[PDB]
Design a protein around this ligand. Structure first.
Ligand code: NDP
Ligand code: OAG
Length: 186
């Protein structure tokens, strides 16, 4: 199995969600970036795995579910089987990560992408090990009810460049944003 990664878009006030929707209006090229990054597998004959909480799964329009080209795993201790259209269900992140080492998945998964929400990010980010954060910085405040956890810059280094990631300021719908990559290894 390849790298472990979080990817998020987050406003200045650390906001990632409001009422099961994004706090800002649709940013089309930001969506394209999310798709490109989670879908592109560096290893032939493999797909990337996406891991997400139950509320993140249901936040995705039904037509966009499952995230296509990727293996879709949902985290839930209430659900007794994967949601309609999902591929796998786990009861914890450790369980999810453990499953990728099983007969069924060992050979099939390239990179793993944690794509939400708050508590799954939090746990991933404070788990020892080699981890990257792909963070799109939406450079305005937006009313939110769900937030990205604190990024501890003593551990997470902001990378000065990354292949495939634009370094300059982007702008869609009057909303400025920029792509960042962080890395820890501990
Ligand atoms: N801006 C961005 O990049 C992103 C924004 N979002 C947004 O955030 C919101 C959804 O996020 P959030 O509310 O944080 O919810 P989550 O997607 O994390 O879902 C939380 C639920 O998933 C289960 N769960 C979460 N973590 C675990 C775990 N470790 N083990 C087992 N089950 C777990 C739940 O189910 P149960 O009660 O069934 O056990 C728990 O109640 C929406 O607004 C969405 O639009 C989401 C991703 C990215
Ligand atoms: N950078 C970044 N990181 C994430 N985790 C994101 C996650 C989402 C999830 N939402 C969503 C997904 C699909 Cl495919 C279609 C419609 C919606 Cl609303 C949206 N944008 C994201 N951007």
């Amino acid at each position: 199995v390849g790298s472990l990664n979080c990817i998020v878009a987050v406003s200045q006030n650390m906001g990632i969600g409001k009422n099961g929707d994004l706090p800002w209006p649709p940013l089309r090229n930001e969506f394209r970036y999310f798709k490109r990054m989670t879908t592109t597998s560096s290893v032939e004959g493999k797909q990337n795995l996406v891991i997400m909480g139950k509320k993140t799964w249901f936040s995705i329009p039904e037509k966009n579910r499952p995230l296509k080209g990727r293996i879709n795993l949902v985290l839930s201790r209430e659900l007794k089987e994967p949601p309609q259209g999902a591929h796998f269900l786990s009861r914890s992140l450790d369980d999810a990560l453990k499953l990728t080492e099983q007969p069924e998945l060992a050979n099939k998964v390239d990179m793993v992408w944690i794509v939400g929400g708050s508590s799954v990010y939090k746990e991933a980010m404070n788990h020892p090990g080699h981890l990257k954060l792909f963070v799109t910085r939406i450079m305005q405040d937006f009313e939110s009810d769900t937030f990205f956890p604190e990024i501890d810059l003593e551990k997470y280094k902001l990378l000065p460049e990354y292949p495939g990631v634009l370094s300059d300021v982007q702008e869609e719908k009057g909303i400025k944003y920029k792509f960042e990559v962080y890395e820890k290894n501990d």
